[PDB]
Write a protein that binds this ligand. Structure first.
Ligand SMILES: *C/C=C(C)/C=C/C=C(C)/C=C/C1=C(C)CCCC1(C)C
Length: 247
């Protein structure tokens, strides 16, 4: 529609805000945190373009009587695994462990994708696994990641609790918006439901990303910027104690 595009436009605005908030504050950061910054910027960025394109009407595919958005579902495939990846950076999982969280997000996002691409009502089955699988992911959020992060660093505990709790909550809302919204049985208005959806992606990235800045700001503020080497030739002596007095 013509008024539906407004949604993607709005979401795109929130993305621009985050992108800059993390880009500017990120460049001012020290050496090491850049990983968490570039990552956070990556999600807000990929999303920003997805909203801008969908906002123009491109990527829209027709389906019998309903319309599915490819760039939307695909955007999630690129963002969702990126979010869980962020959580993995905080705690610090293993090589195989990282593959488990990402592989799960792949099959999950794949369930929903084909979910809306159903010619009848088979979607109930696709999402069926999407829900069970979903719980699997949320489990990891409050699973081993708890002991891994709580034992990684002092600041990690703060960023882990705020991010994990916040993310899982709003994320746990997805099963409702997809099932109830148009992608499922369409309870509310196509425009209203979408508003919540875009809001869900916009809240995850920007939401923790904002809290992300505050926390990281305290990490560097506890010592005023990360320490580094200094250039100084021939130090200043003050104590040496002589051993020769009588000879
Ligand atoms: C920035 C965008 C984000 C964080 C998007 C997250 C999306 C999800 C967690 C979507 C989950 C879904 C399921 C668990 C079931 C199948 C349908 C989906 C794709 C709505």
């Amino acid at each position: 529609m013509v008024g539906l595009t407004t949604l993607f436009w709005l979401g795109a605005i929130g993305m621009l805000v985050g992108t800059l908030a993390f880009a500017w504050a990120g460049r001012d950061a020290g050496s090491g945190e850049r990983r968490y910054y570039v990552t956070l910027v990556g999600i807000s960025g990929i999303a920003a373009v997805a909203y801008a394109v969908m906002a123009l009407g491109v990527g829209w595919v027709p389906v019998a009587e309903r319309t599915v958005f490819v760039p939307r579902y695909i955007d999630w495939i690129l963002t969702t695994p990126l979010i869980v990846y962020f959580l993995g950076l905080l705690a610090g999982l293993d090589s195989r462990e990282f593959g488990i969280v990402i592989t799960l997000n792949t099959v999950v996002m794949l369930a929903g994708f084909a979910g809306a691409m159903v010619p009848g009502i088979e979607r109930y089955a696709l999402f069926g696994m999407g829900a069970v699988a979903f719980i699997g992911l949320v489990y990891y959020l409050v699973g081993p990641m708890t002991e891994s992060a709580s034992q990684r660093s002092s600041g990690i505990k703060s960023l882990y609790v705020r991010l994990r709790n916040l993310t899982v909550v709003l994320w746990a809302i997805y099963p409702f918006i997809w099932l109830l919204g148009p992608p499922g049985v369409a309870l509310l208005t196509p425009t209203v439901d979408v508003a919540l959806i875009v809001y869900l992606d916009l809240v995850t990235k920007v939401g923790f990303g904002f809290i992300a800045l505050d926390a990281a700001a305290t990490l560097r503020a506890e010592h005023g910027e990360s320490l580094a080497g200094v250039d100084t030739d021939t130090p200043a002596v003050a104590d040496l104690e002589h051993h020769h007095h009588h000879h």
